Nucleic acid binder design. Sequence first.
RNA 1: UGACGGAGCCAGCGAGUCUAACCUUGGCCGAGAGGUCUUGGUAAUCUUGUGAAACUCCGUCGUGCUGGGGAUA
Lengths: 252, 59, 51, 36, 95, 85, 154, 75, 125, 65
Amino acid sequence: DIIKSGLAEKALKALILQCEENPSLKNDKDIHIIINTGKKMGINRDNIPRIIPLTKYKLFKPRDLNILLITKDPSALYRETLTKDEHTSELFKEIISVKNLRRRFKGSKLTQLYKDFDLVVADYRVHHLLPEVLGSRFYHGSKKLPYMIRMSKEVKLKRQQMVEKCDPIYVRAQLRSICKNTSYIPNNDNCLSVRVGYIQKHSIPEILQNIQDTINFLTDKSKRPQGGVIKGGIISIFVKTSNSTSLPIYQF
Amino acid sequence: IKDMFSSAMEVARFEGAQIKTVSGIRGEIKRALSKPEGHYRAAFEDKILMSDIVILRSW
Amino acid sequence: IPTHAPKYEENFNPDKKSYDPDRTRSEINKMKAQLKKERKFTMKEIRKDAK
Amino acid sequence: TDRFKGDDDIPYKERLFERDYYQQVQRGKQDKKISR
Amino acid sequence: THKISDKYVLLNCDDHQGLLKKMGRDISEARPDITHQCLLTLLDSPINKAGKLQVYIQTSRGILIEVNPTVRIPRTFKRFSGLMVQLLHKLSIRS
Amino acid sequence: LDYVENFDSPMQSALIASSLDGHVKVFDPLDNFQVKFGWKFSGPVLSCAVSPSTAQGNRHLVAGLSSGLLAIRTKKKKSNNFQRM
Amino acid sequence: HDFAVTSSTRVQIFSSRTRQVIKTFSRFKDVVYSASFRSDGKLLCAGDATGLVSVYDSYNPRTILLSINASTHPTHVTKFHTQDNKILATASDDRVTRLWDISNAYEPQLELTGATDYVRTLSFIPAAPHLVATGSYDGLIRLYDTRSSGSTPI
Amino acid sequence: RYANKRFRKAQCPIIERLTNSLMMNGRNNGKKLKAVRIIKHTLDIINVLTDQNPIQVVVDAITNTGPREDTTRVG
Amino acid sequence: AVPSVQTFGKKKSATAVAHVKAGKGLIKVNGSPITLVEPEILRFKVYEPLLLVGLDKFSNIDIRVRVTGGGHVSQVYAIRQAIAKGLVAYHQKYVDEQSKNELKKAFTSYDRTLLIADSRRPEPK
Amino acid sequence: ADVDLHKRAGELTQEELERIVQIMQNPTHYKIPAWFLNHTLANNVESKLRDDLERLKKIRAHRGI
RNA sequence: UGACGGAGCCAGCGAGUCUAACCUUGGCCGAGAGGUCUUGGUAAUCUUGUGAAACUCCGUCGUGCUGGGGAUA
């Protein structure tokens, strides 16, 4: 249930004081937990990053990071009603559609695009056909993997076509939720890595509190859309940055 | 062909040799590639597959 | 009329390269030309005795 | 701006010549692998 | 220009006895000092200062050089020779 | 100054004049150039014009002041079976 | 249906259906002084505070049709002939108005001198198209027949 | 097809001969729609600067510009 | 039971099939009208079979052209050749022969590449 | 900073120009989005490669030029 | 004969159950062989079919090139 103790704090202190010195890892600024479960979570990895809601620590503000928005076919309505609204007029670094995205950025330009942006956010209608447009660099692992957003707050019924409108308070709202909370992507096996906290924006008690938040949310009985995924007994946590070892926490 | 040599000097040393896959498809080392170091171009009898292993028997 | 002075090197040789005042671009460019001509000559020699 | 002043001289080439829980757990997993 | 064996000289009338006769030509022609003294005259005359003049010089080998009015030509002779060699071999001389 | 002629108006022709004091005034060159109307704006009126004699649409009066601003005043202008029955 | 308003260093063509700026001319280099449409409305002249009468075409601010380098003082009034369509009258703070031909924009086809202080206004006489009534800061509405010399008002 | 007999290019229309001669440099070889567009623009502004027929203007330009004698360097 | 006439126009690799039938007067290229043919500076190349002989010829027929292949200017040239020889063929078949060869004289006096394409090239000099 | 988008740089009030300078000078305090604002290795490996190439010439039977 | 930023629209060749990366950080299972999962970096003329680019149209800007070790925020 509740796990926050001196072994966890000792591990995170040791890793922080290791990353502030260790010259083979002077670039990685991110803390991830490696949830080791017992039973195999059966759900297959589609690349839709589900959102783990934190309660009292927004771990990224939606204005200090580059955001790429990938839209539907014509993109005129989304581009204008995003850029000249003053609610979202300075939120997105770039707004390009799928057609001219795969026209422009091919090959090594995709490595430049990956090194260029820091949050890839796509429309939920055109999100599924990104992995051949965006390449393998975005989907090997998960750190710039694209997030779904709805743009309209309109549901699609059969026998009738969705009217095309976009809502900039809604796009700011769910982008605020996306940069606010953290996210996980499930798989078939037992391992599951979640990014919680940063290297210098966050401190040890807030990282511990949002770690425990993600433990609750993943092991929970409710939130069976998103969070009911640890259906058995969780066995371990580890903590690492992107090129460290795995400092163990909560050995069951 | 990817890696049986480590450099263009080695492939230059072994140009024109006869190689073959494990499926008996004969072939011959044509030219050292430029950009990766130990890679080369070989011309075979017909279209080899990606699942094959080329072979240079030497003594 | 404004009056500028002509930049030139006294005691010129057009076959010799000019004096880049850096020694970490001129020397690496010297050994770039050295490495290229000696690599091309060496592997040309070994592919012709392979023939 | 030169009124019979000419271009200046240039200096000579020889004129320019003459002038711990971390380490405990990583050795623990290393020794675990070597133990197996 | 002439290569000397590691040196590139402008073929003066006085920097040699018989480079011109070892190439074939005669000593009564190898005159760069007179295009030097004409460059001095045209580049100190007041009409150059008012900018109503441009100079083109052209060689016995048919090599055409555009001489801008703003050039501060070297007033002595051997600087001019060493400049003219880099003109004939770099094709351009910067301010 | 400017002047309009034979436009749709009871005044057959009109000379309007702009005079640095807020006032722009219209004079009728038929009854000996008498003044007939005038406007007052918030500064020295530096230039004025009206839309010409064949404007055929929205008829405008503009006066641009020396204060840096401009004032515009306008005057504005079943079925085939059933029908065959 | 459009009117050109001269603020400083930009000329704004407003339209008379919505009263907003439809088109704008920004690429001047000093204070712009005069802006007038030709008699057909096909092109627009603008006099500048550097003596550079730029004529664009109306309803396209990107094509400077030609640029007359007039006198060195600020040209203050520029307008085309009302009867003719190819001569342009530009008067400046040089006490001389000019009738340029917009084919030959290097020398003026007439150079109406004879003033003593700061010509600021042109007009043409609406029936006789040879008659140019200019006006300056010493009273004295001088007016010129263009068939004659032109250095002396009639 | 005006380039397969000797004098057949003498009856290509003169605006087209001006267009074809306009589209030649290293940059814009073949860009005939660009040359047609700029001939269209230059005829518009010839008419707006000189109120006359720009086809008559270009015909006059040909007949004024084409020389009537020339020198050939004798052997 | 309806009169219809199909002709073909071709340039470099463009092809354009024109169906002419007795109708109300509507001319369509690729489903869109004839007044939307791009690149809009060669729209008068498409328009000249119409304006050469007057729209009263077209006021009772309705043509439709399916164009495929080629580039922009090859497509407008195949369109105009298809329009021209389609109108001439309809006038041979369902209207009178006097009007047919009046149309042939008009199109041939303008340019006979409205009716006969240049087909086999080149020359071995 | 509310300054006109079409004024020139000369026609500026002083409070507007110092407002520009303030907005640039404390950008993160003004909640500006932070995305808005942002050698001998060749020599030594090259000497090792020329060493390698000299060794490779001398293991064979070669000469210079 | 530019620089950005959108929009429009046009080909012809090409169809072998075949077509195609590398280096890592770690979790678990397994006797090992290895399997799976997770992760960061480098490279990239994409992957088999739909499609091109030049081109056309539209808004904004506006024409004297470039350097590292030193100095001020």
